[PDB]
Amino acid sequence: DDPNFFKMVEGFFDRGASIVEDKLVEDLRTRESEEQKRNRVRGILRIIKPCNHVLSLSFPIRRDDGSWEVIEGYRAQHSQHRTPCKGGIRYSTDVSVDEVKALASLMTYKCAVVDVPFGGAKAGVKINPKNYTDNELEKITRRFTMELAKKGFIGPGIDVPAPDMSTGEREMSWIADTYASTIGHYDINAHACVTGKPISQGGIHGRISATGRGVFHGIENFINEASYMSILGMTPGFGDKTFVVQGFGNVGLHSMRYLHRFGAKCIAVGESDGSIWNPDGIDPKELEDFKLQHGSILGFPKAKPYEGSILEADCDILIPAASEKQLTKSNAPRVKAKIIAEGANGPTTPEADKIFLERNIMVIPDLYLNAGGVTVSYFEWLKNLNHVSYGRLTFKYERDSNYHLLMSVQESLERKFGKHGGTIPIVPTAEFQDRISGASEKDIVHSGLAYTMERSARQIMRTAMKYNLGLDLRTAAYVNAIEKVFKVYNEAGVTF
Amino acid sequence: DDPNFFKMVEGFFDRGASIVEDKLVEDLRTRESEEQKRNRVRGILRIIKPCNHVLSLSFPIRRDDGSWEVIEGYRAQHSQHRTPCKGGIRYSTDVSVDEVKALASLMTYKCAVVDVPFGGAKAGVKINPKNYTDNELEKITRRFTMELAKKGFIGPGIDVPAPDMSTGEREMSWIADTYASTIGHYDINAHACVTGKPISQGGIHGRISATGRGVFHGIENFINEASYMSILGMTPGFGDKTFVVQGFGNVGLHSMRYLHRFGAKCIAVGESDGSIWNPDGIDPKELEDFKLQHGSILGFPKAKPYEGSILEADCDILIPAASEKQLTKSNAPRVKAKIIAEGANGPTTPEADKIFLERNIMVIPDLYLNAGGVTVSYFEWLKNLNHVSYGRLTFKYERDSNYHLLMSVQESLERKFGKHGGTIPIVPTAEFQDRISGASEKDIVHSGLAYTMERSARQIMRTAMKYNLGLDLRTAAYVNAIEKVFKVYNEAGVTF
Amino acid sequence: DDPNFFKMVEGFFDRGASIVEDKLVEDLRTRESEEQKRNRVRGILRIIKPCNHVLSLSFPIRRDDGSWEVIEGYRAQHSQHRTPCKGGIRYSTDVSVDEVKALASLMTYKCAVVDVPFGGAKAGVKINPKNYTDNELEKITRRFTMELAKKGFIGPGIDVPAPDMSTGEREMSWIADTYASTIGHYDINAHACVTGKPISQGGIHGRISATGRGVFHGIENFINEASYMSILGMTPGFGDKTFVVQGFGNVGLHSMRYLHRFGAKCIAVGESDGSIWNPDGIDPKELEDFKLQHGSILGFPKAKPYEGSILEADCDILIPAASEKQLTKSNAPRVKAKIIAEGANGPTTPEADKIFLERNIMVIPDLYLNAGGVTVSYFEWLKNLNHVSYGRLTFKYERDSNYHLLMSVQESLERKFGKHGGTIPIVPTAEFQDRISGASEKDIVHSGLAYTMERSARQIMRTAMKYNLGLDLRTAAYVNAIEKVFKVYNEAGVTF
């Protein structure tokens, strides 16, 4: 089947654009003919679809052994409506112009869903990182940054790179240092050229768990909605809920940790090399400790190895958080999970979606679910522009206000009841006291992430209801994104 | 009589400058002779008065019919003390250099009254907008922006245009797009080049009702001040208060809506083509619905047409919110309203002010009253610089703090009274619950607007008290503004 | 066969790079092993080959009928060694990334041959210009310029566009005006953003005949070289020389005009729709006048239509100045011309070159021959940077020096011979007098063009002699270009 960076993304836009065409024509305030309005709506939808800027590079590096190599790189920007763009850099041998174009378009709609004011971008360097030493990878990253900077593709007001799976926070420091040295110069905002930096460099707390927390909040919003749970025939809330996590990466680990924290039970954990199964439940902390020392999850005590395919395991909800095309037309009928939460990008095929829709299996789209990382990278970009950590000037002030409020209640009650009843001490609870003492930037970031996922989930539900979609949340997510990008471009003031 | 853009504004400064001259000399910490001090005070007051930069343009456009036209435009900046400047663009056939100069000076003092750190500016394009199509008006606006940008007159750190009566949010999009395309380039702050943009483009919620809310808060501050109400012989508060709104535009509609929301009664509504009168009261919602479909307010049921002049109607307070020179020396003696709230700009003549002062009629100045729009445009400018909507990172965090505070009260009370009394559930009230659920950026903007109008009203009262002025709030408003602009320039560090 | 923008250009580099590899290793001053030197030479040759920057665009325009269209454009820059780049813009439906990449590489070596300090560039807009009105083509050109400018692809110090066949001087004015309006701003050198402008805008005199003059000077250098003419068995000089021009475009017309001016005879003129033949000769002026009014050359008096193929006509030299692949393996054996002068780009196939080399037919490469246009565009770029026409400050000064020199000769002779012989008036000849009176910028430009073509021809001859090439001037031209680009990059100070 076609991969995620393939006509799937283009097909998603095409299906979404056709759906929104009728409504946009009707709700158009401009005075013109119906044919004139329909051409205008279809005309703008054609402008939105392609990536307006794509840069192809070829720059040399000299390897440690002394040989000479020419490295190809790409950077596709999808910004007809908003600047700056935001997108990761992928170091892989199979990157291509078509791939970065598709992923740049995908990031545009992902940012629109969570109301992040960024365009889409994506970079690719056609190397295999395992065949280069750390000294060589630094030279590749620095040289790639220089070529991007000279052509106006990496600036804080232009295009903000982000970490991908193949690039860590070490590479982001190389990008940030290179940008400031050459073209950032003495710009005050040059620190915000890149996101995913270490904490000491202006990075944000809670970035590691960002994608995992977003997955949890995405599920939580749809698990507490009575209308959807009635369709699935399940009780609202996480009470007596069992989930299976396919893949134990960064997303899978943190998603399980926050789900177990709220009463959910992990009855099985999948992996490429094996599977784990326990009806009683799997402790996220114990499994994490086992994985980091043994190098894998097989042989983990308190749970026998699973028999069969982890995807077909009986569970209330399922979390495919690794690889692509895990759910296909072949295995879709045997899936016993009422809810599928796409932690990874494109774990289900378009054919599989049709079977799930028939079987009344809610599939929370990857476009919305794993957007927690994009949201937090937006917060880090804001933090570097603010040049101050969140809450630094307000934590002490809010603490004093909270104690003044409690003293107001205490004094008011004491004079109401007089000497009778003695003194009524009003003190913060243990949970509140820990919140007051341990107040830090990560509390603000997690609060903002939870607010974004909650608000976007409500918008997707309204979009699904308006267009008479049922459990097809994927189309609703794309339709919701298409409308936002359409409105921004339509009112952008560009020449028509 | 002289219009608002006429020697009235110059006369207001001249009267205010003479009043403040004596006090400024005495409260001057510099060591010099009395003659040296008085020359310095008068010397700076001469620097403040004129507009330091005025640009006259003449640029061509080609009309749709193919003919050629040369359009004249102006942009006066009044910034000897602060940058950036802020001011609207007026499309009118009768604009002139003198008019934009006077309005640029007026905006400087209006910004100073509400503590908005902007200089004054004003633009004028000598065209009649009704004689041009939308395609032509876009070309005029874009070309006017390009000429302004090349001469350093439209930048976000230089001069921020604002919407006027003759220009809507559509024009602001044209200005913003033109600036970013040509000279804004990839500046991160290029979004803040203009205010009044649509919401999708970075506009701010609550801009439409901003001027109306400011009028309400301006009246409210002076209606609850016991000292002033004692002079007028009226009880404080809006209880049993009747008001008449002359003009039913954007300012008149929203001013009536918020006044009626707080117990005031609208007994009459004026208009150019007719008048409405009802001692029982007029519902703002019903009248608004009637106006938007019938195109006017005449023939509105539940109220007979008024007989005579709407300005002389018997009411507690009066709101002239349309046109100029409505209150003159001729009709001033017959006015039966104890309070006049200048919603529009210059609705009273200087001669009329003298009669009102004799009759003990408080006239809340237009310089302060209709400054709500300027304040909110300041907030929108800050929002575009912040690159995030207000409260996005704090709404969820504050909600959790509020619930922790209530749980602290509940647990403290429960352990105080033990099992006796059972559980004491502490939950937010219905009004608070709506505030928590419906929390949005417009709540922050309305809060900031109310704080600004409250603080400025207190400053004007102190200025009126210090200079022994009575009900002459107009002079107090100008005197208050003159002192602030004097202090900023005196301490600006410019060469003396 | 493969077109000119195809693996032909890549094949030319590959053959040339292999030839120069041996010599470059030997003449390397760095101290290292032979294997280390050979890797360094081969390593740099790999860096030179690809285009380092390629930009793909997709921007919208609205057609006059109101419909919406998305236009694709490309701009390939080939600059690892020199900046700025220089290259034309082609409006064609069949443009592609591979095509602009090949032509950008070709321009790099063409500039190197004539010692023009520019890198290679090429742009393509995938439209058919005949399907758009002049209003639409202006919007396409202006919008294409804006996108190029924002990404650093059109600046005077970055990349200077030039006119192609499909774009005239009208488009260059659109590009220049758009650049100055948006990003050129008030840069003093913003006038030099583009070349091929009209004279009033800073264009250079003699641009129209530049390519034709270069073809003449290219032939003249190789027609007066005794060594080459001995191989061909022809007398040096243009005396009793007959030439055939295939194609009567701008290049064909001017090439014939200057050849006939120096004694050569045009016995035949080819064309797509017909052919003209006259052993007596064809007057360039009469044929030009006939063409501009009848729209073609068929039916031209004083010459019967030619029978057969114009390429096989018996002539001393042949000038293919139209289309591509005119000389193939099929017709190569029947060609009766001793010299082939490639006025157009790629009129001979690589297979045809082998037959010509066997038959001792000298083929003057198109890489060098039609480089007159590139040289003059370099002069125009210098003129815009100088902000003064050539010779404006020197024509009068040199005229006075010339007359002083003649007066010195006259007075010296008069006193030598005394009264005997009377006066010896030393006056300029008629040819010199016309040169003095009609002195203008075009004289300087034509002088510089002739000097460049002469010097480059000598360099190509030395390169052909050094590498033991015979009449294979095409490989010598590429080998000469490869060495120059190699040396510039090797000594550029880039990291190795």
Author numbering:
A (entry chain D), B (entry chain E), C (entry chain B): 62 to 557
What do the study authors state?
Here we report the use of single particle cryo-EM to identify multiple proteins from three enriched heterogeneous fractions prepared from human liver mitochondrial lysate. Using this approach, we were able to simultaneously identify and solve cryo-EM structures of nine different human mitochondrial enzymes: short chain acyl-CoA dehydrogenase (SCAD), medium chain acyl-CoA dehydrogenase (MCAD), isovaleryl-CoA dehydrogenase (IVD), delta (3, 5)-delta dienoyl-CoA isomerase (ECH1), aspartate aminotransferase (GOT2), glutamate dehydrogenase (GLUD1), mitochondrial superoxide dismutase 2 (SOD2), catalase (CAT), and mitochondrial aldehyde dehydrogenase (ALDH2). Functionally, the three acyl-CoA dehydrogenases—SCAD, MCAD and IVD—are involved in beta oxidation and amino acid catabolism. Finally, SOD2, CAT, and ALDH2 are all involved in clearing toxic byproducts of oxidative respiration.
Functionally, mammalian GDH uses NADH or NADPH as a cofactor in order to deaminate glutamate to 2-oxoglutarate, a key intermediate in the Krebs cycle. We collected a total of 62,508 particles for this class of protein images. From these projections, we were able to construct a 2.31 Å resolution cryo-EM map and identify the structure as the GLUD1 enzyme. In agreement with previous human and bovine crystal structures, GLUD1 consists of six subunits that form the functional homohexamer. Each individual subunit consists of an N-terminal glutamate-binding domain (residues 63–266), the NADH-binding domain (267–448 and 528–556), and the antenna domain (449–501). The GTP-binding site is bracketed by several key basic residues, including H266, R274, R318, R322, and H507, as well additional residues I269, S270, and Y319. There is a large degree of conformational flexibility in both the NADH-binding domain and antenna domain, particularly in the unbound state. Additionally, mutations in the antenna domain have also been linked to hyperinsulinism.
